[PDB]
Amino acid sequence: MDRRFYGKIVIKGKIKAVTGLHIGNPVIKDPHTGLPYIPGSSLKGRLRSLFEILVNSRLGEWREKYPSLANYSPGSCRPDNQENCGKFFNRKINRGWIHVCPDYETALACPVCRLFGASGKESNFPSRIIVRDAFLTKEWEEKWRAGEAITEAKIEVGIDRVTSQANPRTNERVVAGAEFEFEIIYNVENTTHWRDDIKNLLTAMALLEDSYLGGSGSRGYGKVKFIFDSFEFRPLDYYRTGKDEDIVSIDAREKSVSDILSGFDSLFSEVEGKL
Amino acid sequence: MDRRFYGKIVIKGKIKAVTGLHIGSPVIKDPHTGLPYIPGSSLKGRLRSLFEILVNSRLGEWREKYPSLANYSPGSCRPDNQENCGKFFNRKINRGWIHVCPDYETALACPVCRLFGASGKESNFPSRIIVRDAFLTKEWEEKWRAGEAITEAKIEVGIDRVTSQANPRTNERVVAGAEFEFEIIYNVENTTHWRDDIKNLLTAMALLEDSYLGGSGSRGYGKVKFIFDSFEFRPLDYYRTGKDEDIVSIDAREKSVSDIFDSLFSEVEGKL
Amino acid sequence: RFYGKIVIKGKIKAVTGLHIGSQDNPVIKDPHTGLPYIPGSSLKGRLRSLFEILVNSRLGEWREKYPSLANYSPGSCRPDNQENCGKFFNRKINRGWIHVCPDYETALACPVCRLFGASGKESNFPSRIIVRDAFLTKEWEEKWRAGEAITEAKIEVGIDRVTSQANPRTNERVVAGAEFEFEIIYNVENTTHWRDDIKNLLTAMALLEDSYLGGSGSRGYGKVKFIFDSFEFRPLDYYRTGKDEDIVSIDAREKSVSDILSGFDSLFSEVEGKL
Amino acid sequence: KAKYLDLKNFELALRLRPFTIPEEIPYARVDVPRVVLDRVTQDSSIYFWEEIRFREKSGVYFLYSGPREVFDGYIAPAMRFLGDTGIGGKSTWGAG
Amino acid sequence: LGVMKGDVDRLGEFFSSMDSPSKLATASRFMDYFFKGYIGAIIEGKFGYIIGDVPSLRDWPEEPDIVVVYAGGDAFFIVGAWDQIFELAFRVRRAFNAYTGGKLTLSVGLGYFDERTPIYRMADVVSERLDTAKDEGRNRVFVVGRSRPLSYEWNHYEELWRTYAPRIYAGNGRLKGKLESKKGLLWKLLEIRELYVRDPNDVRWAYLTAYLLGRLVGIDTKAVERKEPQPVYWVDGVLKIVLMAVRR
Amino acid sequence: KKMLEKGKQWEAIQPYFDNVVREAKNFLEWSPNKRLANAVTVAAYLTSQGLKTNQVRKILDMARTTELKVKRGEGDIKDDLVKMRYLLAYTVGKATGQSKYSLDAFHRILDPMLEVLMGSPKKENFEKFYDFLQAVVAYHKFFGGG
Amino acid sequence: WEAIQPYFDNVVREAKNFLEWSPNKRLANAVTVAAKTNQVRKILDMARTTELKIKDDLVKMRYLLAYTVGKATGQSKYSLDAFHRILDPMLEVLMGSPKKENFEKFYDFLQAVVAYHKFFG
RNA sequence: GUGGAAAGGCGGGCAGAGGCGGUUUG
RNA sequence: CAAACCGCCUCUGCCCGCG
RNA sequence: AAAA
Ligand SMILES: [Zn+2]
Ligand SMILES: [Zn+2]
Ligand SMILES: [Zn+2]
Secondary structure, three states: OOOOOOEEEEEEEEEEOOOOEOOOOOOOEOOOOOOEOEOOHHHHHHHHHOOHHHHHOOOOOOOOOOOOOOOOEEEEOOOOOOOOOOEEEOEEOOOOEEOOOOOHHHHOOOOOOOOOOOOOOOOOOOOOEEEOOEEEOHHHHHHHOOOOOOEEEEEEOOOOOOOOOOOOEEEEEEOOOOEEEOEEEEEEOOOOOOHHHHHHHHHHHHHHHHOOOOOOOOOOOOOOOEEEEEEEOOEOOHHHHOOOOOOEEOOOOOOHHHHOOOOHHHHOHHHHHHO | OOOOOOEEEEEEEEEEEOOOEOOEOOEOEOOOOOOEOEOOHHHHHHHHHHHHHHHHHOOOOOOOOOOOOOOOEEEEOOOOOOOOOOEEEOEEOOOOEEOOOOOHHHHOOOOOHHHHOOOOOOOOOOOOEEEOOEEEOHHHHHHHHOOOOOEEEEEEOOEOOOOOOEOOEEEEEEOOOOEEEEEEEEEEOOOOOOHHHHHHHHHHHHHHHHOOOOOOOOOOOOOEEEEEEEEEOOEOOHHHHOOOOOOEEOOOOOOOOOOOOOOOOHHHHHHO | OOOEEEEEEEEEEEOOOOOOOOOOOOOOEOOOOOOEEEOHHHHHHHHHHHHHHHHHHOOOOOOOOOOOOOOOEEEEOOOOOOOOOOEEEOEEOOOOEEOOOOOHHHHOOOOOHHHHOOOOOOOOOOOOEEEEEEEEOHHHHHOOOOOOOOEOOEEEEEEOOOOOOEEEEEEOOEOOOEEEEEEEEEEOOOOOOHHHHHHHHHHHHHHHHHOOOOOOOOOOOOOOOEEEEEEEOOEHHHHHHOOOOOOEEEOOOOOOHHHHOOOOOOOOHHHHOOO | OOOOOOHHHHHHHOOOOOOOOOOOOOEEEEEEEEEOOOOOOOOOOEEEEEEEEEOOOOOOOOOOOOOHHHHHHHHHHHHHHOOOOOOOOOHHHOOO | OEEEEOOEOOHHHHHOOOOOHHHHHHHHHHHHHHHHOOOHHHHHOOOHHHHOOOOOOOOOOOOOOEEEEEEOOOOEEEEEOOOOHHHHHHHHHHHHHHHOOOOOOEOOEEEEOOOOOOHHHHHHHHHHHHHHHHHOOOOEEEOOOOOOOOOEEHHHHHHHHHHOOOOOEOOOOOEOOOOOOOOHHHHHHHHHOHHHHHOOOOOHHHHHHHHHHHOOOOOOOOOOOOOOOOOOOOOHHHHHHHHHOOOO | OOOOOOHHHOOOOOOOOOHHHHHOOOOOOOOOOHHHHHHHHHHHOOOOOOOOOOOOHHHHHHHHHHHHHHOOOOOOOOHHHHHHHHOOOOOOOOOOOOOHHHHHHHHOOOHHHOOOOOOOOOOOOOHHHHHHHHHHHHHHHHHOOO | OOOHHHHHHHHHHHOOOOOOOOOOHHHHHHHHHHOOOOOOHHHHOHHHHHHHOOHHHHHHHHHHHHHHHOOOOOOOOOOOOOOOOOOOHHHHOOOOOOOOOOOHHHHHHHHHHHHOOOOOO
């Protein structure tokens, strides 16, 4: 009931992978232009699984602020077999357990399934962020015409603990510094609580730059670091005039912890003026 | 009451699958040529579905420009299962809710329904746009003939939050950069409001150009771009004489937000 | 009277899928073989509807060429439920309103009913075209005997605007690219009316190039395309003696817009010399 | 019950001999649904229409006796005329 | 709207065997009184000790909705709720088997019409399907319209419905557990049924059924001993009733 | 025989498994029910072993390409028939494991039905291997392996 | 197996240009060559770069082919004698030729060697 | 001197919501 | 010279209107 | 029309 539209907050920028990365030992690449890419599902799922962990283990500081977390408790339905109990991760996919609210208007109050979307039997809360596949930047198109190593074949040995025997194999991983170009669109469906979702998404980006992205990562395959070009707002009036009548946040140097830093309410104040 | 006809504005161009493009069926493929395509059902129902919510947000701010928006108030009719009450989304399809006005004189003033058409009991408004199926271009027929891959099989997975137990599946999606050739016909049934209908169709095209088309979309499977070729007019006398008497707007290198407007359509104004 | 019969032959090309239906929705098919076909009524009435709307636009501008359009005002008779009160779409058949003239001598001057035929009371002007039924070209029966699919099964869906709930249905559509073989036989009853009747028939065909033919047309199920082979005049003396007196214009590679202007001053110069 | 005998059987049964009926009728009485749409609202109205739909090699015929100048001056031109305007029915739908 | 015609087969041979008027009068009165009297007592819902198991979509109501147009010497013509007519045809057959000693049979042509249909055509469909279900075997039933390269025996259908129906149909218009949300499994099997009419000789319909039940399945020369049709052909009139009486 | 594929069906359904297979050293062996009858018994004793299933679909896509070339796609339908022989053992030339013995019941039936197609009809002489290629997958799904 | 080594030697004497044969003699010689693994990966990965994209890449590929005997010495000269023998005739013709044709036969031979290498030892 | 004359099975409806190619091996 | 697994599930699948 |  009552889906609305106010605008589309657009987050562009780049992803400077500081350490060599491996989504995938073939990295999955674009079949038309050869080059690798970061998929959009691969970023959205890693932001969601690094944010359900933030929510699940801290159910004190959120449940007064987000109702309908009173149906949960820190845990998982992995030991027993119920799809709906007090344990948090309630949906079994087919062999793994992931939090999805099974109702529309519980997901309308949940702090996970109100931003990343949710499934349901005839309930189905659709998402509010869309995450697009990050290809390279044009300053790696121009580094690919020079015939340079867009990837590298690393050889990571497996040492036997008894016979002291080696067992090497080759991983194939994207080169360090390979800077992919992302695109995240928040879809403003309610003017009351978009502060919560945008601060929530920047929390997920901080917990992503803390963590890794793709591959093992424990051995070094992640180290993802966002570099923002332009938050924008694009109100409804943009899609009817087509002018430059869209609110632009300027943070061309700032950091994902610095944008969520004291001054979120200082930078987004024009969006607050436009709602 | 009173259907007229002055001409037919024809929009031609290309649809650029900037990312991959999933429209399920395995992507649909026509049975003869075997290549994938975009239907016109999948595209009209996604221009509509966006302009719906665009109207639903501005539902009170227009009812002096578009009457019969006064007779709605925002939301769905799911929390009170009735057909036609004060809520905007007032038709049940099978178990889901969609705005279609129930009459001819009501829907003649709806902005959604004068452009995408309506249905109903004892009255019926038919559409003004024709959205034809979009097959691959001339270049990509031959890129298929030269041996390239036109689709891909992408492999995704689903990770358990606790033990990192992962569960794969395979999607099948059109490769990025693939380009389909479309056509949209607005049938000028009234010379009072054709500017508003062409401008609402461009609002729906712009909202589609920021959202996705088909498939997962929130995971990257969308991202259509509109590469314009030709607005044409084809007036009432093109069809009788046959001679090239049709007015063309020169927009071969413009954006769907760059058409939207008085400079382009001036001869169509003067031709009335 | 009668002065011969002009036979127009050619092909139809279903450039997009063609759907007509047979009361999970089948298309109509020949009950013996099983192949589809385009009816003659489904083609003729679509031509008549298109030319009705075109005429209703021009009830002010053709009053001197065609009289008895002076007896009609542009509109429809649905609100004031008296038939032929003075609006154009004046006759109600069962629940819908058509322009069909009520007399012979008023329909001899109305350009729709002069060509497509009227019914009236005590009067009955019969039609002046025969839209012959359209069957698959023998190439497409040979493709039908190669095991190739001649119809498809397209699954469409309806979707909730708030909760995105799929509600699917299927339609059985003819495979795009199909070829049918049409014939339209005009009856030369009065040697004045012939130019205007064939020009109006080709105008009605050219509105159908930009419209559709049956089924969900605005969702992309029409796009018919006329590909002419030849015209024949078949004079009065041909039916008397049975020799070869009939003028055969040849327009093998011409479209209906290339036919209305290019051939009407030129490919009918031989027919006007025989009347 | 049977209505039409084959030419060979028919000549049998004219002499009161045992005969066989054909095991197949050469046509089908099918009723197609049609519709009438008003031009403003596309609002429909069905009626049904019966017709005789023939097979691939099948059709219809009739016989003529009498002299040959009547056939050659009257019936043979009449059959070339009526091939392009049919025998009864909705002949503007290309029926007869 | 379910419109059933259908009469007693080869009855003139039976009345041409009576060798007195006192015997003919008895035989004609009993054959009369079955259709005049003991067919309304069926539709009231009686005689279940003799009738028993029948192909039924729903529990038999207290006051059914069936209108008897005619019921006479050997025939009837009955309309009503089109999926209570279905139980009534087999129920009247099971009661006519019992009223006779088993010596006489009846054919039934069935038609399921939209409620607002002219009555000459609504009668000439059923009266043609009775001749179709009658010139074949004179013990038949035309259960539903069907495609073939058409009717069934009675005991054949009631032996099918013991098997194919209670594994997919629960009762009162509801399918079984977990075959719910698999309604498309029931229609696409009728796709695999329709690769059999397109060619009965091609054997592609066996592994496709084995695949689709993995995601009927095997052939037998008991059919190919004399070329009678395969068991995938005798599932249209059993699946198609259950599809028409579950949510279409 | 749904209960066959029991544990000794590998030692039961190899009575004459490769003899008639090598007797079908061309494609158009027998159009009849012998195709399906062989194709059940081929998968009947694969199932007692591993038979990693989803490493086949490249041949399915390749047969789709050759079938589009049947549908007026290319006049040379010879190179893709050889590209399968290029990829005939590269799978067992990539990695081995537990299901290799079922591959022993898979590699012996390859070269009877793969060395044929150099001087063959391109459109014809192909549907029977195209049917055996799917009925084994189908009945293997039906016995419960995939 | 002295008859097969003479058969391979005669086939490499018949291996003149990059368009070797229309028939299975490409595969029939790939069987005889396949009858190491990590030393071919430097060219099997070089086989990837000849598809996405030029002039110096053929010279670099010939140097990487000569690098196989140009790195390993000792008793690795008799078993690596034919590695220079069959392939390099199917590359000297490819100097004055477009890159879209006449290489896929060499590609299919070079990888049908490896495709039957692990199976046939 | 045709059981005829006139009559578009058609209007409206996104194959969609949810899901890190990943866990361990100096 | 890659050891081992997981290789699709969850939900609707023709309606309202003409006779 | 198998006594509708
Ligand atoms: Zn949630
Ligand atoms: Zn509306
Ligand atoms: Zn008129």
